[PDB]
Amino acid sequence: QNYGINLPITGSMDTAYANSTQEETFLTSTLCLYYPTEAATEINDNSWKDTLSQLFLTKGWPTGSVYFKEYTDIASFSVDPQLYCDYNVVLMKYDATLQLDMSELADLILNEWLCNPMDITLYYYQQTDEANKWISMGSSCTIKVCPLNTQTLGIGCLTTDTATFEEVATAEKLVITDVVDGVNHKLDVTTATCTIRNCKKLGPRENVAVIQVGGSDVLDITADPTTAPQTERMMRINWKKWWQVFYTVVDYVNQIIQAMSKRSR
Amino acid sequence: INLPITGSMDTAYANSTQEETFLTSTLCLYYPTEAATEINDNSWKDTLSQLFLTKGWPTGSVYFKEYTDIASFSVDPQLYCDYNVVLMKYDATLQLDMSELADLILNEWLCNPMDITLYYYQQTDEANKWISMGSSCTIKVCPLNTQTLGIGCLTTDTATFEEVATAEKLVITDVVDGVNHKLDVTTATCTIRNCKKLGPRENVAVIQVGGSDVLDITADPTTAPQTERMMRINWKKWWQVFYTVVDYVNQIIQAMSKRSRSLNSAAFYYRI
Amino acid sequence: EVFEAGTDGRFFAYRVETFDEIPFDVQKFADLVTDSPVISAIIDFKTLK
Amino acid sequence: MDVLYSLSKTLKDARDKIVEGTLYSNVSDLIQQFNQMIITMNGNEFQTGGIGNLPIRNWNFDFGLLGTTLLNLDANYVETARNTIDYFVDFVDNVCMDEMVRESQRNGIAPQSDSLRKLSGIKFKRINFDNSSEYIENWNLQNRRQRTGFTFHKPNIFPYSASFTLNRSQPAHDNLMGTMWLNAGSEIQVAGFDYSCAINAPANIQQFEHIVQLRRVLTTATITLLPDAERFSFPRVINSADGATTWYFNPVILRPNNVEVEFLLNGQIINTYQARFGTIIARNFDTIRLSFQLMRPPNMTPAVAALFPNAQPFEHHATVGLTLRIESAVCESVLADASKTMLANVTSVRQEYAIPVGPVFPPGMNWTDLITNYSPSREDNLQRVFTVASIRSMLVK
Amino acid sequence: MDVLYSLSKTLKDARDKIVEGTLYSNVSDLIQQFNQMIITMNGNEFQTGGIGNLPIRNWNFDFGLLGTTLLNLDANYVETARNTIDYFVDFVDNVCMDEMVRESQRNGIAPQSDSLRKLSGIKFKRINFDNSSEYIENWNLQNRRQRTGFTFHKPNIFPYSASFTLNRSQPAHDNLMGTMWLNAGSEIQVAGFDYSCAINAPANIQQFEHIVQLRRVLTTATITLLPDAERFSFPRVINSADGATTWYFNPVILRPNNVEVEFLLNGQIINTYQARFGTIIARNFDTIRLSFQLMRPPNMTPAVAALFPNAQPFEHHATVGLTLRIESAVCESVLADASKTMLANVTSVRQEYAIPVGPVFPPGMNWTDLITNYSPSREDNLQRVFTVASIRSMLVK
Amino acid sequence: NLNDNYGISRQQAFNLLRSDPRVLREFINQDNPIIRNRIEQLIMQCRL
Ligand SMILES: *[C@@H]1O[C@H](CO)[C@@H](O)[C@H](O)[C@H]1NC(C)=O
Ligand SMILES: *[C@@H]1O[C@H](CO)[C@@H](O)[C@H](O)[C@H]1NC(C)=O
Ligand SMILES: [Ca+2]
Ligand SMILES: [Ca+2]
Ligand SMILES: [Ca+2]
Ligand SMILES: [Ca+2]
Ligand SMILES: [Ca+2]
Ligand SMILES: [Ca+2]
């Protein structure tokens, strides 16, 4: 059990495919859904959770392995999302005005970020690679940046007059900022109501699954404007009600969990 | 990983992994408000940064996270740094608090939630404890017998329950391992979790700024150990304490080792 | 054994006493030109012969 | 054994040379050898078989000699010679079948099939005619210790081994680095794959090495090396080590750079080849080291830049391959090939007469598990059965 | 080679037997042998040397016979005989020093040092007197292939390896499990160490296995198996595999329980010993499997209980050891020992005369790299040089 | 040690005496431990 190390693995091509770990992973794992308040609002039923649980019970998932966790709105969810389960599903409504925020949410939860803190009053920060971004959470973040030159002086901005800084956010609950990698930036931030963290995007999180409910696929996880990929756990649906959506999820929960895979870290 | 590792005793190998990360370390101090109070300066953080720069740590690697009180810090301590140092003042009326904080941060915990009402829980081994965090946690416990009745207590009258925590923010409760207990906790103001102790956290280092060594990290009274990352200092000012820490940070860093299990921000893992 | 070379992409291997071309041996000319003293081709093989 | 090969060779040369119309000048020496063999045999009674479905046969030799008075041969002589040769041919074939099926760890070179011992006695030594064949020659050499050699064409020296090795793995198998090899018979196909095309690795390069450690030495190997191995160059769905989950593999073949093929003997490097593909030679080697690299192209056109992004999805996996075939070689020991049928005759005899599993050979003589542990006992018994199989094949095909 | 040994033996026996006053009835046969040697040698010119700093010498034998007329030898006879013998002794020493240096991958048994090729002729075969010594007897036998064997006291068959293996590791190296071993010469000192003392393990038991795979099969080995390995029983500061960092090792010895020693052959088991110590025997083995355990004491005193707590610090690491020393043994092949100076003579000659490195033996003939790869060519050449070394040491010690 | 174990030619010996980089690096590429050890020791002595 050599943890903290990475060793060469080996195998063969003559070994046969083993049994189906389904009907056991459901029992020794847990499934957490994240629905919006609009769903329960439209529904207007108190026993819909027990109903979906008794339905899951047919697919194999036992009674107390399923969890439902409401969220009033996509931004309130983006505010410190704490996903601690063994299989997470996230039903996400589409709004053309919220596109960037509901893509930042995806880039935050679908992936696994290694996040170090940040202190703006003392230091001036720079990015090193293309995956070392700055994610800001809080209730209203107003972020301004002033890049510096080789000799610690601004570029189109002054290091005293914060009004001359360059604005990238304006009262956003979640922000993910990428800047030019190789230049030191001086920052202004609403530290009182927002925390900023310098995070490196590691390999992806195979434990969550986003399901867009409405419009066409728009989520550009990769900040670089060349890939625009569609990952396997990035699902779309077209909706007019919510019971049909929940029945679809329950009937196709095995494909979802096949698209997902228990975490590594 | 299950596979094995090999070695030797004659070689001088020199062949080893080289890679990159956040810029070759990070460090975070946790100092009490009293220190900045005594100092009365608004440039001492930058002063200490430029000092650490002599020891090698670059500008954007050292951080300070002020904490008002030991209890406030114990309430949801969110450590996310590659090296953590915790300066901690001595107070004989707080021994259990600043030993529970140590047993929480120095050791690595795997915690599952708990539903007091619908269920009655128990401990399996000598490492499965119950940690409760919040603003004021008053806990009461009634052991049970084979026939699901009480023992010196009554399932109905909460006053008959036996008290173990009174007006505490962090509590680490160990009860008899192998019996079902019924609990009463201020669930409105505190959250209790069934936690299991794992291999230690080599990423934090406690520094008792004051009196003699008291921290009994191990709840069992027979060990009373003292780890390499459990330090002591004698103090009359805070500038001298910080200069000492800075002059001897390379030994602190030789005593601390980066994590092995995974990355996480809190003092315990969640596994439902 | 003399190994010549030029930036214009010519390469002649020959002998010292009786100038007579020979197949050019890369992976030997390189290990020689690395360390062994190198000489200018003012009297290059064509004119030399 | 030498006298067995002598019997088989003079019987072959008798069925061939002794034909109607031919001339006694061409066959007088062979006829004298035949008559000497008959004189030696006559009066001895042999037994054969008694293992599995081999029947127990008793041979009694009382024959007449062959005349030497004629100049040209007639049918009245060929008929006698044929009636006298068929019996000896059946006897030698039955002895060879009785000997190919017996095993022993104690002195596997010494003969089993006790009739063959009796022939290895010192009265039957007047039968030797010529020990010319390669197998009997190397047998006599080994008895009179000398540097032998069997020249093999496409030798089956590698046991079938298809397998992979992952040096950077995950549960979801979405960013992998590793090497995959199929070592089969006389050929090897190795291939190193990286799903990131060496974007994070240093200098935009990733190193792959495969060390094949042969069980027996080889010499004068003529080898054909090529890039871009085939069977690891198309989409695949492979199970993990524990056979629990599967992972996909969609390759994109590049060329191996910094390629180095090292033929070693006792760890001492012997032959080295750098960036040379085609027909190469190895003079003495017990180990092969194939060490290649995967180099990210620094300049890329759009159609290939769209395949190697700086993000984890990586639906195209960069690969570099090498194929290596040992077309011909020489070995101081005995193996199987694509030219000779000695192994097939042995295994066919055993499968036909239903011999139980022996202490030495595995069941069915699976060359994989019989080369995997090429111990000296197995090597001796294999030389022996191969020799008598060649001897039998010289008579019955 | 037989004639070289015969020369050496009859010169030895001439320097021993022929002394003033002795009786011709005791040395008549040896005098006839010496005179025949002189006759066979008279008229030949030998050359010796030509490699490294070894000089080039020319020998021309024209001596006179030894009188068969006397009854009691006198000093005027012994003096002439010794004047004759010292030349032959210098010639034989020089031939042996010419032959111990040369090598060949093709027919290493076939002589080198062409004076010895000349002595291999059929006009020199009349010199043979007797071949009784162990090495020459095994030489003649292995040529006339038979079941041979050399007897060894404390043989050097294990190549020097001092290494460990961790089945549970961390970067801090505070809770480990693994096995350490020193395999050197005739001794194997192995030690399985667990820092937790098998508290988190099932049944309070932790297993360890150590598999040694010899390159040549031994026989009739007398072995001493003791517990509590010594050189893995004191504090240590050992480096990681990758050399990055180090770790402390403070051992505390415990007995190995349910111990097992399996002496195997081609994967099959031959001998098995359970909970036996002291002197043991092994009739044949190519592989040794030591299997031992660490059993946490169910009962414990205050001190040892305070040394083995249920928490991670673990400042006293439990260990279980085994020393295994091969005292005597027997082997079909040739090795080194702690009794014989053959390897020492060979290496001393090569080092003295600055012999360039050859195709077969490793540089300087370091027994570690010579037994880690003991291929048949190396085996043959080593047997040859060891035999001529024994010969040279029968004369000059 | 080198002349004894790795038997050495006259030219190689003269050039090693003269401390010739050509033959020194020919050995260091021949992977001669008797020289690689000395050179690694020069490193471990040229550290500071
Ligand atoms: C594997 O699956 C087969 C087919 O359903 C089943 O017969 C077998 O019992 C399974 N293996 C085990 C260990 O149960
Ligand atoms: C490390 O490198 C040295 C020289 O490059 C080499 O001799 C040694 O074998 C390497 N280590 C291993 C374990 O191969
Ligand atoms: Ca946003
Ligand atoms: Ca960037
Ligand atoms: Ca501006
Ligand atoms: Ca407390
Ligand atoms: Ca009570
Ligand atoms: Ca407990």
Task: Kindly summarize this structure in a few lines.
Chain A is α/β, with parallel strands linked by helices and 265 residues long.
Describe the protein.
This is part of a larger assembly, with two copies of chain A, two copies of chain C and two copies of chain D (397 residues). By secondary structure, chain A is an alpha/beta fold. Helices cover 19% and strands 25% of the residues of chain A. Chain D starts with a helix and ends with a helix. In chain D, a hairpin with a 2-residue loop joins strand 11 (257-265) and strand 12. Chain A binds chain B through residues 1-9, 30, 84-86, 112, 114-117, 119, 121-125, 128, 132, 197-198, 200, 265, and chain B through 1-5, 20-23, 26, 28, 45-46, 49, 59-60, 63-65, 80-82, 260-263, 265, 270-272. One calcium ion is lined by residues 96-97, 100, 168, 170-171 of chain B. Chains D, E: One of its GO terms (molecular function) is host cell surface receptor binding. Chains D, E: Belongs to the rotavirus VP6 family. Chains D, E: It is found in: Virion.
Descriptors:
part of a larger assembly; 6 chains; A: 265 residues; alpha/beta; 5-stranded parallel beta sheet; 4-stranded antiparallel beta sheet; D: 397 residues; alpha+beta; 10-stranded mixed beta sheet; 14 strands; binds 2-acetamido-2-deoxy-beta-D-glucopyranose; binds calcium ion
